[PDB]
Amino acid sequence: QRAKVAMSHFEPHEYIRYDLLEKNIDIVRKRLNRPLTLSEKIVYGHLDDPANQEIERGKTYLRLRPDRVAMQDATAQMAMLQFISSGLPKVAVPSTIHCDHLIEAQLGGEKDLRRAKDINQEVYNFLATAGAKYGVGFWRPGSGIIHQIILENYAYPGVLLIGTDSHTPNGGGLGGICIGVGGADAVDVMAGIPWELKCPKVIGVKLTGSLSGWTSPKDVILKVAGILTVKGGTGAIVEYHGPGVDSISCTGMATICNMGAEIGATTSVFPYNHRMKKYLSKTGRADIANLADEFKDHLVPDPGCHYDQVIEINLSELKPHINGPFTPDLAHPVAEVGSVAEKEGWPLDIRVGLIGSCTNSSYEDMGRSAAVAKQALAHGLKCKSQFTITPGSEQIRATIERDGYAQVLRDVGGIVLANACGPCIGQWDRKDIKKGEKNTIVTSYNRNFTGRNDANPETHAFVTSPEIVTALAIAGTLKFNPETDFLTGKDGKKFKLEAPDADELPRAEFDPGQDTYQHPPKDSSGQRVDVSPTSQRLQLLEPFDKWDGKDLEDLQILIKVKGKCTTDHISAAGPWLKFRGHLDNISNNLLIGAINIENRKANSVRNAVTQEFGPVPDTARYYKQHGIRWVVIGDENYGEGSSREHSALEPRHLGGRAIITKSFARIHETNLKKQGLLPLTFADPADYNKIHPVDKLTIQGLKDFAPGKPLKCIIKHPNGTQETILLNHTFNETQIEWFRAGSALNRMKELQQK
């Protein structure tokens, strides 16, 4: 470039390329002859061949070059084990590993971490030395949660970042296009080969007005989530625009983008503006803010760019919301959730109140919660509900501890957890309830699908802002309304809660903390990575079978799934995180949470030759060692949720060939294709009704598998009738080669020596 500004402090030699962004935007701009949205500018500004790339929203697969890769320790293991199989020497773009997903909440900060490190020394150590070996930066356990370390250190306007986590859109709060992927997408960028992405549509949400009172940034995506729903954002990027943008802070902007993962959006982004400039300078990146100020026409939407749908939200009419209890999109004003709870049969007294995580743990957030705590304490009140605080990073723990917020929150009775996901992915030894107990918990997180936080199917979880969680945790009931209601203080007087006031960023600078990162040594030409051969924690990958050149006749249906089938139903979290680097060990959780349309139950499918009902994993393995290839049949938005590539490897390992659904979620469908399976959707969703557990399917036409050509499937019913349906797919000729080779990885390897 002519400028020479580093990407971050951890890669001083790797410089931001806005000259390249601008050359490619301008190449593109002139083929297209129209105004581009901001996400078109950053996405198309990162094409590997802008002159030849065919660009059609919701139609072409864009071939991109991401700037940096970020991995999280529950998905970095499989990501690094597949990278280890590419055979490549070192990674090709800046990459980092963050250790946040294997630390369980039990006693508090310090104690839960010493136990995580003892318990997990094998995995942490594989990650650290594979880091030292292949050049990936390593954030040491307890250092923070990946989306917070990224926003505070690695995100900047104009970055195209990919992370092995669904909540990676968090970065859009700093004007970057940060998309979540499975580990095999991460090894493509890391291997140096172009990454593909189906050209997104752009939903535009225009923000008008200013935020007030109890209303936070969190509210804007709770309202939008309710407006679009879980199915609403699939295939698009939500771009936020309007006067109202400058009324939100950078970390508030990151809250909104972060929760956009729950409506199925490819990512979410906000335009470079002064709030982001400010945060850049307060997080030690004044120079990124200054460089960006000179490339500002490339970091805002063009005038009159076109959104395929526009949603208009008035921040000034907006008022506090609590979403749930079993999806992020049943939206409620905080004002009404009391009544709905009693009309509906929802536990009214709030059991545990949880604030924090990477969605709501900025200094601003911690401060507004403390500004509510400070008033209850000022009337000798304390938390009527159990209360936990999770800092998203060591830097946020260190700075809020120092500016006093952390003690305020201990004084109303909160317990500060380790700077790790903890109860947000379900990594929580909860004890106040009995299992099966019916109870209500309120968090400031994002996802509140079933059993996500404690695996108690009957726990009713609502998500809202940290300030409303504190206010409702002192109250101990969903019946309470902060805005309106009075509290009886220790002294017998009533008073009400003042809407919090708080500094957006520290008056002072931010305390980084001690000893959070391990640099890769460009030194250790002799760094060695060893997976002990008999480890129950880690296992080297073994190449999947290449395709047989034949059609898939007489496939047995392992399970026909009724309803919602999220990646937590396919590959559960909680206790299976322990085996996230061991494929034949986590495979014993294949589809145990899914509902079998035959008997309305989970984990009891009927074995075809023994005619006895039992676990799905077992039955699949049965089929496998008997030579039975099988298929999974699903309903809408299959593979919905978390990025877990183990939802695609695990059917591949137990002998699955195809998953035929009415619709797939984005990240799950890339992962099926990457692992050599067939993701197929019905060309008519009414055909899901022609297929029964007992039918055998033949998928025909693999021989002349073509982009756009649909596949013909013959349904063979027990009485000798058969039916023929058509099945569509989104395989381009790049993905058909992954199919052929048996996985994308087997293909990757054919491009060297075969």
Ligand X SMILES: O=C(O)CC(CC(=O)O)C(=O)O
447 is a catalytic site residue: yes
The one of ligand X, ligand SF4, none whose footprint includes residue 198, by CB under 5 to 8 A per kind, is ligand X
644 is a catalytic site residue: yes
Neighbouring CB atoms inside 10 A of 712's CB total 15
Question: What minimum distance in Å lies between the beta carbon of 469 and ligand SF4?
Answer: 15
Q: Is residue 666 a contact point for ligand X (CB under 6 A)? A: yes
- Per DSSP, 556 falls in state E
Binding residues for ligand X restricted to 214-243, rule: CB under 6 A: 234-235
What is the three-class DSSP state of 415? strand
Of these residues, 67, 73, 112, 165, which one is catalytic?
165
Q: Is residue 165 a contact point for ligand SF4 (CB under 6 A)? A: yes
Neighbouring CB atoms inside 10 A of 314's CB total 14
Of these residues, 332, 447, 460, 747, which one is catalytic?
447
Q: How far apart are CA 559 and CA 603, in angstroms?
A: 10
C-alpha distance from residue 369 to each of 372, 422, 468, 504 (Å): 5, 20, 8, 13
67 is a catalytic site residue: no
What is the b/e burial string over 585-598, where b = at least 16 CB atoms within 10 angstroms of the residue's CB? Answer: bbbbbbbbbbbbbb
Of these residues, 357, 369, 642, 743, which one is catalytic?
642
The one of ligand X, ligand SF4, none whose footprint includes residue 147, by CB under 5 to 8 A per kind, is ligand SF4
Q: Is residue 275 a contact point for ligand X (CB under 6 A)? A: no
72 annotated to bind ligand: yes
Going by their DSSP bridges, the two strands 595-596 and 350-356 should be labelled as unpaired
Of these residues, 100, 185, 219, 454, which one is catalytic?
100
The one of ligand X, ligand SF4, none whose footprint includes residue 425, by CB under 5 to 8 A per kind, is ligand SF4
The owner of tokens 């009886």 is: 488
Question: What minimum distance in Å lies between the beta carbon of 264 and ligand X?
Answer: 8
Report the residue number, 585 or 663, with the smaller CB distance to ligand X: 663
Q: How far apart are CA 359 and CA 261, in angstroms?
A: 11
Q: Is residue 440 a contact point for ligand SF4 (CB under 6 A)? A: no
740 annotated to bind ligand: no
Neighbouring CB atoms inside 10 A of 513's CB total 18
In DSSP terms, 682 is beta-bridged to 727
Of these residues, 46, 68, 101, 629, which one is catalytic?
101
In the chain, breaks (C-N over 2.5 A) are found after none
Q: H-helix or E-strand containing 371?
A: helix 363-377
Among 120, 266, 395, 439, which residue sits at the site for ligand X (rule: CB under 6 A)?
266
DSSP string, 691-717: --TT-EEEEE-GGG--TT--EEEEEE-
The one of ligand SF4, ligand X, none whose footprint includes residue 58, by CB under 5 to 8 A per kind, is ligand X
Residue 655 contacts residue 620 (beta carbons within 8 Å): yes
Report the residue number, 198 or 277, with the smaller CB distance to ligand X: 198
Residue 235 contacts residue 198 (beta carbons within 8 Å): yes
Q: Is residue 444 a contact point for ligand X (CB under 6 A)? A: no
Q: Is residue 419 a contact point for ligand X (CB under 6 A)? A: no
The one of ligand SF4, ligand X, none whose footprint includes residue 421, by CB under 5 to 8 A per kind, is ligand SF4
447 annotated to bind ligand: yes
The identity of residue 577, as a single letter, is: L
Binding residues for ligand SF4 restricted to 384-423, rule: CB under 6 A: 421
First to last CA, the chain: 37
The owner of tokens 């060297």 is: 752
Q: Is residue 710 a contact point for ligand X (CB under 6 A)? A: no
Q: What residues contact residue 99 under an 8 Å CB cut-off, 6+ apart? A: 73, 124, 127, 138, 139, 140, 141, 142, 143, 420
Site map (CB under 6 A) of ligand SF4, residues 578-617, x = contact: ----------------------------------------
In DSSP terms, 333 is beta-bridged to 321
297 annotated to bind ligand: no
491 annotated to bind ligand: no
Count Cβ atoms within 10 A of the Cβ of residue 528 and give its class: 0-12 exposed, 13-18 middle, 19 or more buried.
Answer: exposed
The owner of tokens 């080297």 is: 540
Report the residue number, 53 or 251, with the smaller CB distance to ligand SF4: 251
Among 75, 82, 357, 671, which residue sits at the site for ligand SF4 (rule: CB under 6 A)?
357
The one of ligand SF4, ligand X, none whose footprint includes residue 240, by CB under 5 to 8 A per kind, is none
What is the b/e burial string over 619-654, where b = at least 16 CB atoms within 10 angstroms of the residue's CB? Answer: bbbbbeeeebbbbbbbbbbbbbbbbbbbbbbbbbbb
Among 147, 167, 198, 657, which residue sits at the site for ligand X (rule: CB under 6 A)?
198
166 annotated to bind ligand: yes
Q: Is residue 362 a contact point for ligand SF4 (CB under 6 A)? A: no
Report the residue number, 588 or 728, with the smaller CB distance to ligand X: 728
Q: How far apart are CA 103 and CA 637, in angstroms?
A: 30
Binding residues for ligand SF4 restricted to 51-110, rule: CB under 6 A: 100
Q: How far apart are CA 727 and CA 729, in angstroms?
A: 7
452 annotated to bind ligand: yes
Residue 123 contacts residue 143 (beta carbons within 8 Å): no
57 is a catalytic site residue: no
The one of ligand X, ligand SF4, none whose footprint includes residue 77, by CB under 5 to 8 A per kind, is none
Question: What minimum distance in Å lies between the beta carbon of 670 and ligand X?
Answer: 8
642 is a catalytic site residue: yes
Among 106, 316, 535, 730, which residue sits at the site for ligand X (rule: CB under 6 A)?
730
Q: Is residue 643 a contact point for ligand X (CB under 6 A)? A: no
Q: Is residue 116 a contact point for ligand SF4 (CB under 6 A)? A: no
Question: What minimum distance in Å lies between the beta carbon of 425 and ligand SF4?
Answer: 4
Q: Which stretch binds ligand SF4 (CB under 6 A): 56-64, 355-363, 650-658, 742-750?
A: 355-363
Q: What residues contact residue 54 under an 8 Å CB cut-off, 6+ apart? A: 60
The one of ligand SF4, ligand X, none whose footprint includes residue 321, by CB under 5 to 8 A per kind, is none
Q: How many residues bind ligand X (CB under 6 A)?
A: 7
Q: What residues contact residue 432 under an 8 Å CB cut-off, 6+ apart? A: 351, 352, 386
Q: Quick one: which of 350, 320, 329, 332 has its CA closest to 460?
A: 350
Q: Residues with catalytic annotation?
A: 100-101, 165, 447, 642, 644
Binding site for ligand SF4 (CB under 6 A): 100, 145-147, 165, 167, 357-359, 421, 424-425, 445-446
Residues that bind ligand X (CB under 6 A): 58, 198, 234-235, 266, 666, 730
- Known binding positions: 72, 165-167, 358, 421, 424, 447, 452, 580, 643-644
